[PDB]
RNA sequence: ACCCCCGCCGUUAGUUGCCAGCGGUUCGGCCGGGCACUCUAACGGGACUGCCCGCGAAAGCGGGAGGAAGGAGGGGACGACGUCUGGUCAGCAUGGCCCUUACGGCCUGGGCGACACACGUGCUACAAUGCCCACUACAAAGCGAUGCCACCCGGCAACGGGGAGCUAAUCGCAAAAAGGUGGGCCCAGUUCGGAUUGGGGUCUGCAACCCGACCCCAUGAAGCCGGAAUCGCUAGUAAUCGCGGAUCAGC
RNA sequence: CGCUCAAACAUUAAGUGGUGUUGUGCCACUUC
């Protein structure tokens, strides 16, 4: 229930209730930023990677 | 503080009496930052002064804190394991921390309902001495007297 | 004066006096004073003879309270007990009935702590 | 004719319009003592006026905004000081020393992460 | 009589095109207000630094958005054309109304 | 808690509305512990599921505004 | 108190307004 | 140290603000009007033990003036060679290993929320520096187009209907709360404390029994400041008061 | 209030014992 799990969040054959956000890259269901479509873990990487437009290290 | 002596913190003078002792004790009645309460309480106390005694409020306030002002406290010194209570002098900037505080206690021990009248009537008995705040001074002073035995560790 | 048949609120705010009445609180106390137009300030020791009668005839006749109310509460529970439902099994054992905590807390309907371990 | 300075304090900034006259002190409308009803911290604002004896000779229409109530009075201090030092540069020799022309950068420091209140670590444990 | 909104993620490139706009416009017809530096939105998304049970020492970034405004009273037939063959942004956003 | 259209599942009403046609028995396998007891399903004995099995429980007149799940515990120890 | 479900000092904590808090 | 925020000033800008300046005013920054200031957000300036004196071999230290800011101005970003054979193969990657009408796939439902009990972390308090209620006032940084919902109506209310504007420094979440003023309560297990429970009720969502959030009546508990021990903070800190956001149909 | 006990708990990385304090009848030694 890892592989097949990802292909379940693209179908939505039943109620909209059973719909949830899924990490595009990895496949996590927890900590998925509705802005990126990524999970807290990797979007951090792709944030070290500068492959994320605009996204920059912040300090104040 | 192990590095520097840590210079004492200077607070701003009163806004009605212009004195660095008044506000020094105000923030002492102050709880959680509500500087207003303790201030109002304080003055409503000095209004009790001018009603009970024809004296001037700040006068009975200067003489009150002075009375509950510890001359010689008792502290603890370590001399090779053994742990005594070596008495000695009370730093001139401690007498002021304590005294202003030691009125706070007994005024919060009073049966009186309103807070103004607990610091008012208490400061009217501190300048007298018979107050139950000075009875927190007379006590610690006794602990030093009776301990004047182990005085040869006065450092 | 005995208002709830046997309950006697006296010597205090007439509005708050009705609070100690089983079935009356802080919302029904502001209602009976406005339907009989009575002073919510004056104490109970001093009011019209027709006012003790006024609130006694009204209040004790407006709805259910006192002991006949507690009476029904027990029954309502005794109905959750008889057939034996879930919102019944929670009275029947004494645990909380809102699916709350039981692994910790819940001492309100679990009594004092028992330890043993 | 006019005097002006610019004093700030914790987001709460304040302008200062000085004009020769009575002792009138209107701040964004609002009578002076009125806009600080029941606030002992008030009377501290008009401090740079008794250090110059020109309290009963100068009105002043203030325009403060931002921050809380008590912090504002601090943005009126820096302002009244800069206003009576502009049209009067000589009052500065005996003004700055007593302490009246300083920003005072004491600001609520950012809350840290791993804390509730920046300098507030979760009640430690070990059991 | 004409307004334009410049949104972007890099104020360096955004400010260069904001200034680029004034040169052509002004110096060919209409009175034109300089670059108006509008308030700055910032999307700060904080995240747990570690990949597991390490709720602390985390790391957070921000997605700054720079917004600048410029107006141009008269849309000169000489400027309308002066603002189509000289405009070469990149990762910038622009909008035009009336 | 719902108020308009007291919720339920149609299947169960399906297999029971035929029981009101010629009043036969009162037996049926169910899975909708969610649904609401019908004031018209009085006297039947439904078997409600709880993750473990089916519990045959009789319905009366007092219990109506409740659900089947109430009369079908899920915690082995009641 | 702040833990009250029927006071001004309560509704200012539970987010809700209800009867005991100004509204349209 | 080179970077960012906050402190002082100036340049560039005037759909943010301003009877400051005058004119009209439904006397509301609402119209004209203006860039001053406030602000907004970019560019730079500034502070280098530089100046004075004292101490000193130098480095450096102590004192004073100027100054918005001194001796690192407050705050962040930044964590070495390695250690913990620390953590995670369940985020992903990945050698080895086992399963393969199955250790894989589906679904409804249950469960992860079970309670004789124990620890960590928490919130609310046990009240007169307070509880309650009315009126009245002041933030920052943020977030919002089947989302934020102005205002009108019903309703005790949660809410619903009607409907304006808003992809937003233009509309909206928006009352900030404690504060201020007036009022009540008058030391009581209380108008403290709101745990628990009965009844009625609203909304999201196929569906709230197991298990949701919230409203009203009612019921109103342990609780009168906490043993051993133990916890945080050197200043706008602790404490104390609020507000929003990520996650989300809701919680 | 003092005195004896079997536990819950607290002191230590851990163990042990001790002890602290409630409950009950009236720092030492050690970690194969
Ligand atoms: Zn990922």
Swiss-Prot record, chain A:
Keyword RNA-binding on entry: yes
Entry binding sites for Zn(2+): 23, 26, 39, 42
A Pfam family of this chain: Ribosomal_S14
Cellular compartments per GO CC: cytoplasm; small ribosomal subunit
SUPFAM superfamilies: Glucocorticoid receptor-like (DNA-binding domain)
Cofactor note: Binds 1 zinc ion per subunit.
Keyword Acyltransferase in record: no
Gene Ontology molecular function terms on file: rRNA binding; structural constituent of ribosome; zinc ion binding
Co-factor requirement: Zn(2+)
UniProt entry keywords in alphabetical sequence: Metal-binding, Ribonucleoprotein, Ribosomal protein, RNA-binding, rRNA-binding, Zinc
InterPro entries: Ribosomal_uS14, Ribosomal_uS14_bact, Ribosomal_uS14_CS, Ribosomal_uS14_sf
GO biological process: translation
Function description: Binds 16S rRNA, required for the assembly of 30S particles and may also be responsible for determining the conformation of the 16S rRNA at the A site.
HAMAP family reported for this sequence: Ribosomal_uS14_2_B (MF_01364_B)
Similarity comment: family membership: Belongs to the universal ribosomal protein uS14 family. Zinc-binding uS14 subfamily.
Subunit structure: Part of the 30S ribosomal subunit. Contacts proteins S3 and S10.
Designated name of the protein: Small ribosomal subunit protein uS14
Encoding gene (name): rpsZ
UniProtKB/Swiss-Prot annotation, chain B:
Database matches in InterPro entries: Ribosomal_uS7 (IPR000235), Ribosomal_uS7_bac/org-type (IPR005717), Ribosomal_uS7_CS (IPR020606), Ribosomal_uS7_dom (IPR023798), Ribosomal_uS7_dom_sf (IPR036823)
Gene Ontology MF: a single term: structural constituent of ribosome
Keywords of the record: Ribonucleoprotein, Ribosomal protein, RNA-binding, rRNA-binding, tRNA-binding
One family name in Pfam for this protein: Ribosomal_S7
Keyword tRNA-binding in annotation: yes
GO cellular component: small ribosomal subunit
Keyword Calcium attributed: no
Function field: One of the primary rRNA binding proteins, it binds directly to 16S rRNA where it nucleates assembly of the head domain of the 30S subunit. Is located at the subunit interface close to the decoding center, probably blocks exit of the E-site tRNA.
PANTHER family: RIBOSOMAL PROTEIN S7 (PTHR11205)
Family label: Belongs to the universal ribosomal protein uS7 family.
Record text on subunit structure and interactions: Part of the 30S ribosomal subunit. Contacts proteins S9 and S11.
Protein name: Small ribosomal subunit protein uS7
Organism for this UniProt entry: Thermus thermophilus (strain ATCC BAA-163 / DSM 7039 / HB27)
UniProtKB/Swiss-Prot annotation, chain D:
GO biological process: translation
Residues annotated as signal peptide: none
Origin superkingdom: Bacteria
GO molecular function, one term: tRNA binding
PROSITE patterns xref list: RIBOSOMAL_S9 (PS00360)
InterPro entries, sorted: Ribosomal_Su5_D2-typ_SF (IPR020568), Ribosomal_uS9 (IPR000754), Ribosomal_uS9_bac/plastid (IPR023035), Ribosomal_uS9_CS (IPR020574), Ribsml_uS5_D2-typ_fold_subgr (IPR014721)
GO cellular component terms, A-Z: cytosolic small ribosomal subunit
Keywords, in A-Z order: Ribonucleoprotein, Ribosomal protein, RNA-binding, rRNA-binding, tRNA-binding
HAMAP family, per the entry: Ribosomal_uS9_B
Function: Part of the top of the head of the 30S subunit. The C-terminal region penetrates the head emerging in the P-site where it contacts tRNA.
Family, similarity comment: Belongs to the universal ribosomal protein uS9 family.
Subunit structure: Part of the 30S ribosomal subunit. Contacts proteins S7 and S10.
Protein name according to UniProt: Small ribosomal subunit protein uS9
From Swiss-Prot, chain E:
InterPro entries: Ribosomal_uS10 (IPR001848), Ribosomal_uS10_CS (IPR018268), Ribosomal_uS10_dom (IPR027486), Ribosomal_uS10_dom_sf (IPR036838)
Molecular function terms, GO-annotated: structural constituent of ribosome; tRNA binding
Record has Nucleotide-binding as a keyword: no
UniProt-listed GO biological process terms: translation
Keyword terms of this UniProt record: Ribonucleoprotein, Ribosomal protein
Listed GO CC annotations: ribonucleoprotein complex; ribosome
Pfam family, one: Ribosomal_S10
Role according to the record: Involved in the binding of tRNA to the ribosomes.
NCBIfam families the UniProt entry points to: PRK00596.1, rpsJ_bact
Subunit field text: Part of the 30S ribosomal subunit.
Family recorded in the similarity comment: Belongs to the universal ribosomal protein uS10 family.
Name of the protein described by the UniProt record: Small ribosomal subunit protein uS10
Lineage, opening ranks: Bacteria, Thermotogati, Deinococcota, Deinococci, Thermales
Gene designation: rpsJ
